[PDB]
Symmetry: C3
Subunit: 667 residues, 3 copies
């Protein structure tokens, strides 16, 4: 039909064909001829993964040992594997092979917080630095099967460190540089990292950040860390190094030669751990394989973004998140193109920084978070007209609900109505894109991620019956019907948590945690999390971890944290706190600031609640457990719709929550 | 037609394979007849490169190709096969079959009590092996380590062995009936870094103290860093030592159901198997042993993909290693792993298992057959055993009468019987009738198997005996793929035991006879000669000769390695020493005199009164007895006369 | 015709290789004449990929193929060859020849006293190396470890080096004449986990205190967990420390005569050779190719030939031309433990005659010693099996060159004055036997892959044209070039690559005459 009774988003939405200028700027014949070819290849990727992914793995990856079996295992048994028997090395495929072919080709276009510190590393340069750092790590005893923590800003050293660790067959664990000391401690200890790579201080938005200081604080409780390599980012002499543990990047790398042989690893040996927050309270180390993850990165970077050897990719993200892993580092470097590594913020020295960088380097592909787009539309629209952005042809949206208005704003003010937009849906555990419009191929519906990608057999499941929904104009739980090459393989030393989270809720399926709708054309519309996970400014947060942080403050007796819509950050965190012996509304403002600072120092500045609400007690059930549902409805001004609260043990509390929120949220 | 030497063979009619064997056989046999067998056998002896090369590539999956089929000689103790090759044993026994047919049964596990029986598919097995291998890998187990297994004959023993091989470490299976002292000797000789066991066992309805005996042994096993403990009974009173012992279920739950196998070289050790003198760790290679296991299981038993093998043995012995685990799993067929006894809950259990699973092949020790004949004969007829076509006898003297009983009461005179001759150090069958191919003579093992150039040797001269109707020492003229490669960290004992007694041959320690049809009849153990500069001496004859001297109270004679004369004889019992040496020369012969006669007042014996010759051997080469104090005196006494 | 700069070249007649060289040669030479050499040489400079690639596949056996022949630059100190390839040095030196002909002699061992001499076939050598490697493996030695060797020039030293390489570990040979302090400095710089030595040594009849010097050094070498001690004299008064020192014979007896070799990457280190003492590091594939290539073409070695390098494995000379070079090519090599003077000054010649050696390689210092004290001894022995006479690595004056040529060579042999250094791995400039005519005192033409040049020291600019003098420098790296100084790559850059960026600095001055022949003039320091 033409009308939708379920997928209201899709009603009256005209398809948006790729503008003709995209093809004028495309340097070669596209990788896919048209949408009909896409659908034929997609069906083969589902019906015959062996015949589809086999040849692509042999085209796009360089193997030290051939694989004998494309695909093994099932979701239900949590034993997925790809390219069994194969051996390869990630740093060889991202660096060496390109350096041998064209050593002077740019690899890392590094834009520092202050442009005067910007520089460019060629693939040849990259090979020498990666070899030297791997040389240091090898002399420290790092070997295949070890884990190594990285705590670095988004710059050349973070990329070099990751590739040097992979060069030895060890697994890197990158810890976002905005994390607090406690967050560093939790991740380092779960992985039992033998070494850490960090720097003395950072520069962000003109400010100096305390990086090494936080490591020292965390490391007093990290007994497995034997050595730390410290890069002189500011060269501040007041930054202390602990004798016998900490060593300088420049001093140690000067001891080793600019070539070190890469270590062959099996396709299914771990490439990295990436700690993620869930509905648990403790971070879980998501583990990615080597071959399957790398194939997914190359495949999605090539086909969804339409990347060619002549192109230049600017992923405005951070390696602390999966976005930087896959689309700032592995994807582009696998394909041998330059990637722009941006250390600063979109606002410094002014709101034109993104566009100055695109123009400076003639970037052809730009990949950004809707959170930044909303900020730039609000505060920096007047900066765009100052820059020539005609080198661009593909505009990606990293992964957040994008409204049709922002889609149109992005399309008009950045793309001049001449670029293709790729709203990519995916998650840390998918490794690479799951649903996205292929640049130059798939027509767009603004706000829809469009079609599932190669190897992704998406489905909607009825939340009442657990049964897969046939046909279109449907909505339900978003699930995937078979595993795919870049799917996460386990949670580090906690495979049971992995099973309970992803494979057991809907047996036979992978559970994304999202709800979605599928319209009459088969386009998917993401409707957001069904599992109460909260994403603030593109960053996935654990409400339970924030509650635990607030409870550490001994003035607090109970804490409940929920998420709500926010026009800036997508979602915001609202914290409800009951104090032990408080009162004094003159101390309210002050005690609220103290609790926010508590979360800032325990988790990190980016997990701080938007607002802390002081209440006399929280709503609970007969069993005594907190009813967050009530807090959610109140915090979104849906006080009506609470319904029958006679089932609570303390219904009288609800009145207090409605009034406290209406009094305190503003102020 | 008549035999003047091989009396066993006189008047023995050849027993052709019953027609029903071929009716039950699911496909054309692997060999048409005895003429084809002999053509293939001659190639396996004259042209091993051209014979075993193609079979190795057919039957095994390689990570790296081999460049040389065969290297080394018996005389130099440097046998090697498929040099340059790389492979993994668990990949060949599990992964490749799981990818092809994950739902095919792999381990048919019959527990002591049938209520606890279960079946693991090849897909199931891969996941369990991967998870346990993950635990061991997180503990630091890697290529070149040894890991001890002390488990009953059940799925966990099989999983443990394969998980250890998956990492390229070598497993050392310790029979679960062994005492604490027996565990300690084996763990320490191998320096195992980890141990896999269970809390308690179930045998014949009784509860056995498995973990308790391990704890007792481990107080003197400093190399064991961690222990993985399966909850076989889940008895809450079984203590786990904090920081050392961990639960199988708790740890394997942390790891995924796939873990990459580790490639090893063809000649990297697959396992140590300790023999029950001092226990010695028989070391087997990877590629050659696996090829021997698959080849003998395929051709001697006539195993096809449709078949089902029930080896009523134990992984604590080579029988379980080769024909309960590696042989059948290599060929991708199901194998029946039986934890109990032939008598529990009743004397029909063996036959109830065969009927339940429609086993096509049954392999058992004559010792078990004699028990069932004595106490449970009438139970056999109560079960449908018509799925069987091959009945194997594991390896012990089977009389013609037991052969006929086995053939009639179990096989209903419709099955082929395979009396297999082999030993721990041979890895796989040496002499056996190929099922459906070789006609039987009851009590004869028949023809040597592929790659086995068997011979009869005169025990005095070591010279090969030509022609048939002959008897002598059973010896092998060249090494073979699954031949044991060394004794762990004691290669000189290996040489002295197998290669040096009869230079140019492998010494089986057995005597045998060869009849006019070329069939071998195993005649049992020879009496342990010591080779001194080409003269073979009997320690027992020297002891007896010394004892004839009425001034002598006790005498014990032992052999030890010697760099010039090969071995030397030391006798434990200035003028009397000369008289005793002269006594041996005039009684036995001029070249039989001991290198030295040492005067001692006493030396160790056991409760049975048998002399602990091991003690003297170690003393002459520089508490467990019934008279421990005795040992002390000789530390000086050996230093006194020698 | 005249030289205004290269005064050494004036009035020097070319010395064609004598006629008898080709009569004694067992097969058609590997290169026909100087013109064919210059065609091959130019390809090795212009197109190293197409020249060395095929040669690497011809002369070495690979466990994994390489994907790239050559990588890196001198200026960046990141040279690499045969990238991606895997191989094992002991497989190429032992296993593959043992399989083909196990009874062919490998180590012709002449002891300090001839009564103790013996010969190991390739089959023999595989068993002894397997057993020693089995000992080291049981001790935990693995790829990436270093093992120190403090042994005289005898079978045990060759077996130890090969057994360490068999496991993919790196051997660090310490000349048996070094003091305890010299042992300590090397052992600690390399952090060796094990040491292989002997109880005592025999040199010129005298007994040397070998284990005793080790024991003194080991008090300050905490990384050494175990020591393997060969009973060279079997002196019972030599102390072994309980729990650290073990006997070679006692431990090897426990292990079998075959052990699988361990694959290493082309650019994994094969050995550290210390020259304070700096550890020169040599790759595996590049070094081995250089060793086989120079031994084959400069010395004209054929499968039937027999090489006598009168050197010591404590120096690079024994590494490349007593062990790796000849064993790679599958020919016998003579390992001489003694001195040219004991029991008499006819020892070298009695050995050449005894084994019908075809090639002899020695330093001029020994030549000067024999000319002074043992010239009459030469005539007593039959040296008619020789055809190539080598000069290891010192300035050979025309007088010595003429004496060497007449009295040892009977004016029927070719002489190869080889110029090279520890850091070059193998010969840099040398006359190819049966190909390059000689000028006494001149090393002649650069070898394959060696693009030699002269640099004006004052200006640092490369000197065009001939009749020139200046600093000797190489313009691109070569397969056997040392890759670093152990854990001190900055000292490596400062010494070799930074003085003249874009060049490899030899530290020597040289002259190039109108024919292109090079005359080594000595250190610039
Ligand atoms: N195109 C999209 N449109 C709407 N919502 C989206 C879209 N992509 C992702 N999400 C939500 O983000 C979660 C994943 O979070 P995370 O693992 O941090 O990955 C982030 C960071 C990099 C990729 C996203 C999904 O499960 C969804 O809820
Ligand atoms: N078919 C046979 N007929 C008569 N005797 C036989 C036969 N097979 C073996 N033996 C004797 O058992 C020793 C080997 O014992 P073992 O290594 O424990 O192996 C056990 C477990 C597997 C085989 C037996 C032989 O050397 C012989 O003396
Ligand atoms: N044919 C030669 N003519 C004149 N001088 C020569 C010649 N060969 C080398 N040198 C000098 O020896 C140094 C190298 O010494 P070393 O590294 O010990 O290697 C030497 C000793 C062991 C092997 C060679 C060169 O740099 C030069 O100074
Ligand atoms: Cl006597
Ligand atoms: Na390989
Ligand atoms: Na390999």
């Amino acid at each position: 039909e033409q009308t939708h009774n379920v997928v209201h988003e899709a009603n009256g939405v005209k398809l948006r064909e790729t503008p003709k200028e995209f093809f004028e700027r495309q340097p070669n014949k596209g990788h896919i001829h048209d949408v009909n070819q896409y659908k034929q290849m997609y069906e083969q990727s589902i019906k015959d993964p062996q015949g589809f992914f086999g040849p692509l793995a042999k085209e796009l990856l360089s193997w030290d040992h051939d694989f004998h079996t494309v695909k093994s295992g099932t979701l239900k048994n949590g034993d997925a594997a790809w390219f069994l028997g194969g051996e390869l090395n990630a740093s060889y495929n991202c660096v060496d092979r390109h350096a041998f072919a064209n050593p002077d080709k740019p690899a890392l276009i590094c834009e520092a917080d202050d442009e005067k510190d910007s520089h460019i590393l060629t693939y040849g340069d990259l090979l020498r630095e990666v070899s030297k750092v791997a040389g240091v790590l090898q002399s420290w005893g790092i070997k295949k099967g070890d884990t190594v923590a990285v705590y670095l800003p988004m710059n050349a050293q973070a990329i070099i460190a990751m590739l040097a660790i992979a060069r030895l067959g060890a697994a890197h664990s990158v810890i976002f540089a905005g994390f607090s000391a406690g967050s560093i401690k939790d991740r380092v200890n779960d992985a039992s990292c033998k070494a850490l790579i960090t720097c003395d201080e950072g520069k962000r938005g003109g400010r100096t950040t305390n990086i090494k200081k936080l490591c020292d604080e965390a490391l007093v409780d990290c007994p497995t860390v034997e050595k730390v390599l410290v890069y002189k980012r500011t060269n501040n002499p007041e930054i202390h190094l602990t004798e016998g543990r900490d060593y300088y990047w420049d001093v140690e790398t000067a001891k080793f030669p600019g070539y070190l042989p890469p270590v062959s690893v099996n396709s299914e040996d771990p490439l990295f751990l990436l700690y993620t927050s869930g509905s648990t309270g403790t971070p879980k180390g998501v583990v990615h394989s080597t071959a399957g993850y790398l194939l997914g990165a190359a495949l999605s970077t090539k086909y969804i973004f339409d990347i060619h050897p002549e192109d230049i990719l600017f992923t405005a993200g951070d390696v602390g998140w999966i976005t930087g892993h896959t689309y700032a580092l592995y994807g582009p470097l696998l394909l041998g193109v330059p990637t722009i590594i941006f250390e600063g913020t979109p606002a410094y020295p002014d709101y034109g920084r993104f566009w100055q960088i695109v123009e400076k380097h003639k970037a052809t592909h730009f990949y950004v978070a809707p959170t930044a787009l909303r900020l730039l539309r609000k505060a920096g629209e007047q900066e765009i007209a100052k820059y020539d952005l005609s080198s661009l042809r593909t505009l990606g949206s990293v992964g957040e609900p994008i409204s049709p208005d922002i889609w149109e704003w992005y399309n008009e003010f950045v793309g001049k109505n001449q670029c293709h937009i790729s709203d990519t849906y995916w998650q840390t555990e998918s490794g690479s894109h799951l649903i996205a419009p292929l640049a130059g191929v798939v027509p767009n519906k603004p706000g829809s991620a469009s079609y599932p990608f190669f190897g992704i057999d998406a489905a909607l499941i009825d939340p009442v019956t657990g049964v897969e929904i046939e046909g279109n104009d449907a909505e339900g739980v978003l699930a995937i019907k078979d595993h795919w090459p870049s799917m996460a393989r386990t949670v580090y030393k906690n495979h049971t948590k992995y099973m309970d989270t992803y494979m057991n809720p809907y047996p036979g399926y992978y559970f994304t945690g999202d709800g979605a709708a599928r319209d009459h054309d088969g386009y998917y519309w993401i409707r957001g999390r069904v599992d109460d996970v909260v994403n603030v400014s593109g960053h996935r947060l654990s409400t339970a971890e924030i509650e635990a942080a607030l409870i550490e403050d001994k003035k607090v007796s109970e804490a409940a944290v929920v998420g709500i819509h926010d026009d800036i950050t997508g979602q915001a965190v609202i914290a409800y706190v009951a104090l032990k012996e408080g009162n004094s509304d003159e101390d309210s403002e002050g005690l609220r600031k103290e609790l926010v600072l508590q979360v800032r120092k325990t988790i990190g500045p980016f997990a701080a609640p938007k607002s802390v609400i002081i209440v006399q007690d929280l709503p609970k059930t007969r069993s005594g457990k907190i009813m967050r549902r009530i807090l959610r409805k109140v915090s979104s001004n849906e006080a009506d719709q609470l319904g029958d609260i006679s089932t609570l043990s303390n219904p009288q509390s609800v009145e207090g929550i409605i009034s406290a929120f209406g009094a305190q949220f503003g102020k």
